[PDB]
Design a protein around this ligand. Structure first.
Ligand SMILES: [Ca+2]
Lengths: 98, 124
């Protein structure tokens, strides 16, 4: 159930992976190698609270997990996503042993 | 999702809703027993809702399966959200069909400028 503020219907957004230099300069001191920025530096389109954990899928492959940002859809504050291409071995080995 | 559009119903068949009374986070089905999500979505008990489009209305494609295991990345940092990843084991395997399906893990990292699809029931 969607409660007070979430939508009932699943929402979709097309967005590009951003360069690491754009990501680090958007969020100085806060970006690790396990994070990727996806979205628009001009703001307006972004993920938001309630989206965390959900997918960023590029060319049929899960590349991002909705993680955090400053606000939502803010200028120069694109979404920051967990970088899935760092974790295939963690995922496969954890699944294989559990 | 701010500034998006409504997905075609069940056109994102790997998308799940994490529910503890109400929707609070998303996830992605990567095999019939396992959902990958974010570690800061951790709760001690989680119901995974697959096959959803309208999370408030029973449509007939839903599968509601309680989590049997919830595993956060051991190096998750709750202050910086580094290693913000989590795996949820379903207590019984989801039935895979045209509306409930898995998404492939990446075979390499995506290049800057690659266009991707983001989805969820977050604030619009
Ligand atoms: Ca429903």
């Amino acid at each position: 159930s969607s409660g007070s503020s979430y939508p009932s219907l699943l929402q979709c957004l097309k967005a590009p992976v951003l360069s690491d230099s754009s990501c680090k300069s958007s969020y100085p001191g806060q970006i690790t190698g396990n994070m990727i920025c996806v979205g628009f530096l001009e703001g307006g389109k972004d993920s938001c609270q309630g989206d965390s954990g959900g997918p960023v899928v590029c060319n049929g492959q899960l590349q991002g997990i909705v993680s955090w940002g400053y606000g939502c859809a803010q200028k120069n504050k694109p979404g920051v996503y967990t970088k899935v291409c760092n974790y295939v071995n963690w995922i496969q080995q954890t699944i294989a042993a559990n | 999702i701010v500034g998006g559009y409504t997905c075609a119903a069940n056109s994102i068949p790997y998308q799940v809703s994490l529910n503890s009374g109400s929707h609070f986070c998303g996830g992605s089905l990567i095999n019939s027993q396992w959902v990958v999500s974010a570690a800061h979505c951790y709760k001690s008990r989680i119901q995974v809702r697959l096959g959803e489009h309208n999370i408030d209305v029973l449509e007939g494609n839903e599968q509601f399966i309680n989590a049997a295991k919830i595993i956060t990345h051991p190096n998750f940092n709750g202050n910086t959200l580094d290693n913000d990843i989590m795996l949820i084991k379903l207590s019984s395997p989801a039935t895979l069909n045209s509306r409930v399906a898995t998404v492939s893990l990446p075979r390499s990292c995506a290049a800057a400028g690659t266009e991707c699809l983001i989805s969820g029931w977050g604030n619009t």
